[PDB]
């Protein structure tokens, strides 16, 4: 034994041919079509309302359902191109958005557009948040955690992120949304129970996530049980391996409009 449902999922995923993998990875998931956004942004459209990444749709999914309620000064850790920061800036109660990402050679760089509220956004590349000192904020967002074929690596990278965000959470933001790349190992589930006892919130699987990642979002507006919410997600991803391939559900891409606040 000792294999976790998610660890069993990850092995199977590892044992899957390329062929099994790419019909699996989107089997039955929710998705936005980026074709129009990607073309407009390539051409230089800044006021067409496009999201700079699929990230805006994911945060929209959570905010549309109250899984979190951004407000005040938003900090966006690992902001990449900025999908979460620009989405944050359209929300009425939000007043300031500060995004930080590493950028450079292998890493997404911030994209400058003029979606609604763009003028309260500042994205800063060249920042390794692991060496950034924590600062107060009202809404704490973190979308760091890069996929790996090894679950030991994914655990390691998730633990590293979670230790870092502890210092930010100790400043007591009222709202938060933290990517947990690997929630599925025994160490992670225990760690996550402990964090939830101290800081509240709970885990949510965003259905725009692909079947090839077990990521879940630790959000201030959930009250869910760690073991049940993570195990439920492992069985979901296991069960989409055994059935025949399901179609993708598209939602509309986000229209972030345009204009200053
Ligand atoms: C792919 S994402 C950004 C997704 C974003 N939420 C959106 O909607 O566009 C996570 C980002 O974290 C950056 N990152 C990874 N490690 C980092 C670190 N130690 N410090 C700062 N940024 C990091 C990656 O380059 C990556 O672009
Ligand atoms: Cl990472
Ligand atoms: Cl990452």
Residue numbers in the entry: 4 to 264
Give the original sentences from the paper that presented this experimental model:
The MTase domain is highly conserved in flaviviruses and is responsible for methylation of the 5′-cap of the viral genomic RNA. In flaviviruses, the NS5 MTase domain performs both N-7 and 2′ -O methylations, using S-adenosyl-l-methionine (SAM) as a methyl donor and generating two S-adenosyl-l-homocysteine (SAH) molecules as reaction by-products. ZIKV MTase is composed of three sub-domains: the major MTase core (residues 54–223) contains a Rossmann fold with seven, mixed, β-strands (β1 to β7) surrounded by two sets of α-helices (αA, αX and αD, αE) on each side. The MTase core provides the binding pocket for the methyl donor SAM and after the methylation step, it houses the by-product SAH.
Recently a series of ZIKV MTase-SAM complexes have been described, therefore, we will only briefly explain our structure obtained with a new crystal form. The cofactor SAM is bound in the central cleft formed of β-strands β1, β2, β4 and helices αX and αA. SAM predominantly sits in the hydrophobic pocket with several notable hydrogen bond interactions. The adenine base of SAM forms H-bond interactions with the main chain oxygen of Asp131. The main chain nitrogen atoms of Lys105 and Val132 also form H-bond interactions with the nitrogen in the ring system of the adenine base. On the other hand, the methionine of the SAM forms H-bond interactions with the side-chains of Ser56, Trp87 and Asp146, as well as with the main-chain nitrogen of Gly86. As expected the cap-binding pocket is empty in both of our SAM- and SAH-bound structures. We identified a significant conformational change in the loop L3 / helix A3 region, a region which is well known from previous structures and our MTase-SAM complex to display intrinsic flexibility. Although ZIKV MTase-SAM and ZIKV MTase-SAH crystals were packed as tetramers and dimers respectively, both scored low interface areas of 534.4 Å2 and 526.7 Å2 as calculated by the COCOMAPS server.
